[PDB]
Amino acid sequence: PPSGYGVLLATHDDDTVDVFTSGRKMRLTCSPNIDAASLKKGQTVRLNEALTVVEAGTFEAVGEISTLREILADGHRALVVGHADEERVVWLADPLIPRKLRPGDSLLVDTKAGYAFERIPKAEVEDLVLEEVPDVSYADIGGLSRQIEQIRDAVELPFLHKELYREYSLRPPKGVLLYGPPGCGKTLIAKAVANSLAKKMAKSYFLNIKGPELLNGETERHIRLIFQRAREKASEGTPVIVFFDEMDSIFVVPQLLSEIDGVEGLENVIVIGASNREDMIDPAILRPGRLDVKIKIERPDAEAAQDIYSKYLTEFLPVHADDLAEFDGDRSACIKAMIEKVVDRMYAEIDDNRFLEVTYANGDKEVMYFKDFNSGAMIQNVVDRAKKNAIKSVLETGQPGLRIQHLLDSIVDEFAENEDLPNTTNPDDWARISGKKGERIVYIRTLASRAIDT
Amino acid sequence: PPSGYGVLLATHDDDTVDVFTSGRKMRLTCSPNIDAASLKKGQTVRLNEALTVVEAGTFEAVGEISTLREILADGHRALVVGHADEERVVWLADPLIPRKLRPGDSLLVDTKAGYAFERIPKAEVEDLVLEEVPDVSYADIGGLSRQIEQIRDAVELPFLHKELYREYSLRPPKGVLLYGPPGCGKTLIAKAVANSLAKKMAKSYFLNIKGPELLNGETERHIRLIFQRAREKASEGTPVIVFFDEMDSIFVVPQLLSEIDGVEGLENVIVIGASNREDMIDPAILRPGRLDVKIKIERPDAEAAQDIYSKYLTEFLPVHADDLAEFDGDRSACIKAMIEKVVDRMYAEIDDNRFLEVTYANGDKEVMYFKDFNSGAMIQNVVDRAKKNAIKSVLETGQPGLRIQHLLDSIVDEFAENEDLPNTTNPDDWARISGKKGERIVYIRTLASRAIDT
Numbered sequence: 001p002p003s004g005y006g007v008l009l010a011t012h013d014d015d016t017v018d019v020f021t022s023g024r025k026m027r028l029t030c031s032p033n034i035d036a037a038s039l040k041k042g043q044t045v046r047l048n049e050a051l052t053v054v055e056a057g058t059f060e061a062v063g064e065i066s067t068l069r070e071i072l073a074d075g076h077r078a079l080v081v082g083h084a085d086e087e088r089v090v091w092l093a094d095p096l097i098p099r100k101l102r103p104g105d106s107l108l109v110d111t112k113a114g115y116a117f118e119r120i121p122k123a124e125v126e127d128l129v130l131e132e133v134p135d136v137s138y139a140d141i142g143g144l145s146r147q148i149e150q151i152r153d154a155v156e157l158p159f160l161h162k163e164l165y166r167e168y169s170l171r172p173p174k175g176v177l178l179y180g181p182p183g184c185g186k187t188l189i190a191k192a193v194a195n196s197l198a199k200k201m202a203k204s205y206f207l208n209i210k211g212p213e214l215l216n217g218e219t220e221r222h223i224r225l226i227f228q229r230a231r232e233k234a235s236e237g238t239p240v241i242v243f244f245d246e247m248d249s250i251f252v253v254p255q256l257l258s259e260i261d262g263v264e265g266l267e268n269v270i271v272i273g274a275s276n277r278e279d280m281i282d283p284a285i286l287r288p289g290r291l292d293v294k295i296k297i298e299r300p301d302a303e304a305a306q307d308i309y310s311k312y313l314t315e316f317l318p319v320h321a322d323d324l325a326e327f328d329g330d331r332s333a334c335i336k337a338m339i340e341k342v343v344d345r346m347y348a349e350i351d352d353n354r355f356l357e358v359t360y361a362n363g364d365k366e367v368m369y370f371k372d373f374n375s376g377a378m379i380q381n382v383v384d385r386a387k388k389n390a391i392k393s394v395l396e397t398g399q400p401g402l403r404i405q406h407l408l409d410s411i412v413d414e415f416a417e418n419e420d421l422p423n424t425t426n427p428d429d430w431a432r433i434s435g436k437k438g439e440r441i442v443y444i445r446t447l448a449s450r451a452i453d454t
Numbered sequence: 455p456p457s458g459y460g461v462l463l464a465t466h467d468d469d470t471v472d473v474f475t476s477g478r479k480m481r482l483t484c485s486p487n488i489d490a491a492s493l494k495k496g497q498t499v500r501l502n503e504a505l506t507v508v509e510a511g512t513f514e515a516v517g518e519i520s521t522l523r524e525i526l527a528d529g530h531r532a533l534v535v536g537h538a539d540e541e542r543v544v545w546l547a548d549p550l551i552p553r554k555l556r557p558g559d560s561l562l563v564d565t566k567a568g569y570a571f572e573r574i575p576k577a578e579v580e581d582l583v584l585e586e587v588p589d590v591s592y593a594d595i596g597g598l599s600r601q602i603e604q605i606r607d608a609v610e611l612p613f614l615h616k617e618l619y620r621e622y623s624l625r626p627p628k629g630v631l632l633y634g635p636p637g638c639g640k641t642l643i644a645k646a647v648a649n650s651l652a653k654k655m656a657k658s659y660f661l662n663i664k665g666p667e668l669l670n671g672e673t674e675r676h677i678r679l680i681f682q683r684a685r686e687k688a689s690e691g692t693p694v695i696v697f698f699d700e701m702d703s704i705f706v707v708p709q710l711l712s713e714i715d716g717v718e719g720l721e722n723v724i725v726i727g728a729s730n731r732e733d734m735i736d737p738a739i740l741r742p743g744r745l746d747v748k749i750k751i752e753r754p755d756a757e758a759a760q761d762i763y764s765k766y767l768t769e770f771l772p773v774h775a776d777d778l779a780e781f782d783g784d785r786s787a788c789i790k791a792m793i794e795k796v797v798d799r800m801y802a803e804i805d806d807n808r809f810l811e812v813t814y815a816n817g818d819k820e821v822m823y824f825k826d827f828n829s830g831a832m833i834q835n836v837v838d839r840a841k842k843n844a845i846k847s848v849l850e851t852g853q854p855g856l857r858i859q860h861l862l863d864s865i866v867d868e869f870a871e872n873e874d875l876p877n878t879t880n881p882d883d884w885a886r887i888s889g890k891k892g893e894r895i896v897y898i899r900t901l902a903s904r905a906i907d908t
């Protein structure tokens with residue numbers, strides 16, 4: 001019994017069906033065997049040489065993919081765009097007509113029959129818009145108590161006391177800019193605020209996107225998908241943090257602005273952005289309604305560095321026997337001392353810590369030290385090289401443990417490693433140095449000895 | 455039993471029909487059952503293998519989409535453009551041949567048949583060109599009385615006194631430029647004038663488009679769609695304000711200039727444009743016939759700030775009991791005196807209010823204070839920070855209500871938050887400061903302390 005196929009389009013009271021077979025739409029009668037009521041829109045039906053619907057199958061599983069623009073008002077049809085930007089209306093097959101179809105989704109289609117059969121999930125798209133459980137907590141962050149309070153007030157506080165906000169006629173902020181010199185805590189602070197917020201659901205969503213991930217379709221589609229997924233998770237009533245890390249590279253702006261304005265309706269979606277370059281930011285992003293709350297994560301001072309070191313010099317690190325000698329086996333007092341020694345030597349104004357020499361337009365010259373260019377990322381890197389020198393010490397001398405001297409040697413080795421490179425400094429620093437003097441910087445020099453343009 | 459299909463093209467005196475079936479154009483006989491006079495252009499018809507019309511169906515509801523260029527003279531044909539820029543003429547089916555089909559509308563089409571069956575609305579084009587009831591009124595806007603008279607004289611007055619305008623041979627203005635530093639009221643006035651003019655109808659339309667919306671089809675298709683809708687609403691005889699907010703980004707201009715010039719015939723359509731960057735504006739937009747009326751929204755002086763505070767420090771805000779003591783429970787007097795104290799504070803030349811230092815080309819230096827860089831947005835954000843600090847004090851101290859100190863602390867906090875970044879300052883300020891001094895500005899810095907590019 002040699003037989004052909006077609007796509008089912010419509011079922012009537014007549015007990016006949018409209019089927020797309022052999023490249024054209026025809027009305028065909030069903031065999032008495034098959035029940036015409038149990039058939040479904042878009043289902044592949046089997047035929048014979050009299051062209052009678054003998055059997056019902058499943059939905060077509062291979063074909064063209066189109067990107068869904070919208071579902072039309074009637075609910076049955078959808079507007080989709082193909083590879084050549086050809087825009088077409090098609091019927092939604094039964095597996096679509098929870099989860100909700102949204103603008104940006106990829107649908108398998110037969111454009112000859114005019115049907116859309118399935119939603120094809122795409123990784124890359126999924127792993128772009130994926131929510132993550134945040135790693136970091138406020139206890140992992142050192143030296144930023146002030147800024148943790150600002151981010152709490154902006155993000156966390158509105159949700160906890162909704163009615164007290166309504167009482168004082170205060171509309172909560174909805175966008176945050178983290179900004180400042182690199183390696184100082186903006187990624188950490190953003191994850192930590194998402195973490196403490198999730199912990200106060202004792203059911204929370206945190207989308208982490210880095211700048212480079214956007215430039216990977218074209219940036220329009222990236223932003224459209226990201227905010228559409230935020231829209232999805234927002235429907236549940238849950239708080240949704242959409243974090244744009246490493247935003248430096250971006251400034252593309254008009255869709256980001258347009259999408260942030262678009263989520264103003266939704267009271268539970270918050271946008272946080274992070275930028276190393278305050279100066280290159282498009283002012284549009286910082287206007288009322290968008291990134292309202294501007295939180296500056298600065299470089300650490302001596303007191304902050306003691307806190308940051310405490311996160312990486314724990315008492316679960318092997319300590320050398322000579323170091324423990326001076327504190328008679330008490331590792332709490334040994335380390336807290338070791339952290340105070342390593343910080344004092346990092347932050348002191350000695351000829352060994354000299355880093356830059358600045359020359360101003362009036363002929364004056366000032367010398368900057370490591371104290372003025374430190375970061376949390378640099379403190380951690382100093383600890384990691386100290387650990388690696390202890391691991392080398394184990395192997396080379398036989399004696400286990402981390403000495404004070406491994407850290408102290410690691411400071412100047414770490415700063416010498418970055419006493420050339422462009423990663424180490426930032427316009428916020430030159431602005432700050434120039435500012436305090438009140439003069440323009442005309443010549444910079446490191447102290448090996450190298451020069452840097454102004 | 456098994457039957458095919460086709461599209462109806464024309465009906466004759468012969469009681470026969472032209473039908474597009476199976477990729478070809480046919481003359482077919484209607485069955486005796488069918489009344490050929492009641493059939494309609496572009497309608498789907500069922501057949502048999504004798505190829506005789508047995509039933510009238512509905513119109514095709516899936517397929518290609520094209521953008522309508524125009525309707526031809528005969529009234530029955532449309533010139534449409536498909537996805538590959540393939541322009542074609544097609545017949546209009548009955549449901550099109552109320553409302554008005556216009557250039558820009560998306561039409562469902564079968565190009566092989568040569569027919570357009572339906573106008574499919576698009577969500578994103580519909581939300582672009584949607585009118586809105588304006589939120590803001592003149593009572594909500596503080597400190598801009600002159601500018602409110604100027605916007606009234608341009609937009610409102612022509613419509614109220616048409617025959618008095620005719621008497622003096624005065625042609626009414628076509629368009630308004632709102633321009634000045636950011637955060638000072640330009641958006642507010644534009645919707646306040648749409649509001650007061652809608653109130654003088656006791657039907658009027660107000661389209662609100664932001665620059666960013668245009669950049670996200672191509673930029674000049676956006677502008678065609680907007681002005682084509684403005685024509686649709688102008689046909690009613692009522693006023694139509696088309697507001698282009700946040701145009702800083704734009705300057706593309708040619709289609710804007712062309713569409714403003716084209717709409718000058720319709721004297722019930724007004725175009726308002728807002729810009730923060732006076733200096734970057736293409737002079738073409740400001741030439742006679744287009745944005746004739748230039749209204750400058752400046753930064754508020756002390757007395758303007760009194761009026762702006764009063765919009766956000768109302769006596770329906772909880773006020774602390776200690777603050778209510780000194781006016782014996784009188785809230786009007788308590789708040790009026792609170793507003794005078796916070797204003798006097800923020801407009802003072804105290805060391806706490808030092809903002810920037812401007813160095814000139816002759817060596818002279820001038821200290822700029824907060825008063826010189828204030829705005830309506832900053833006043834409101836100072837109020838919102840105080841409201842937040844009240845909310846925190848009730849949680850922390852138990853004692854409800856907002857203290858004067860919450861406002862006063864909030865001033866320096868809000869300025870410190872924005873001391874660093876862009877869009878707190880603007881080229882109009884340097885013009886003003888360089889102007890009043892009569893010297894070029896060579897170096898600038900904030901007073902943390904930090905320099906700016908100039």
Ligand SMILES: Nc1ncnc2c1ncn2[C@@H]1O[C@H](COP(=O)(O)OP(=O)(O)O)[C@@H](O)[C@H]1O
Nearest residue numbers: 141142182183184185186187188308376377380
């Ligand atoms: N304040 C801090 N406390 C503890 N660790 C820090 C701190 N700042 C930076 N670090 C360390 O250095 C890394 C730098 O990351 P990040 O916080 O993202 O800086 P940035 O925001 O400049 O990229 C962190 O992953 C962390 O290991």
Ligand SMILES: Nc1ncnc2c1ncn2[C@@H]1O[C@H](COP(=O)(O)OP(=O)(O)O)[C@@H](O)[C@H]1O
Nearest residue numbers: 595596636637638639640641642762830831834
């Ligand atoms: N003159 C004013 N009176 C009252 N509030 C103002 C005034 N100017 C600005 N604001 C406040 O600050 C915000 C900035 O508004 P807007 O008028 O859009 O400034 P822009 O000129 O930058 O478009 C407004 O939402 C409003 O809350």
Ligand SMILES: [Mg+2]
Nearest residue numbers: 186187245246
């Ligand atoms: Mg980071």
Ligand SMILES: [Mg+2]
Nearest residue numbers: 640641642699
């Ligand atoms: Mg505005």
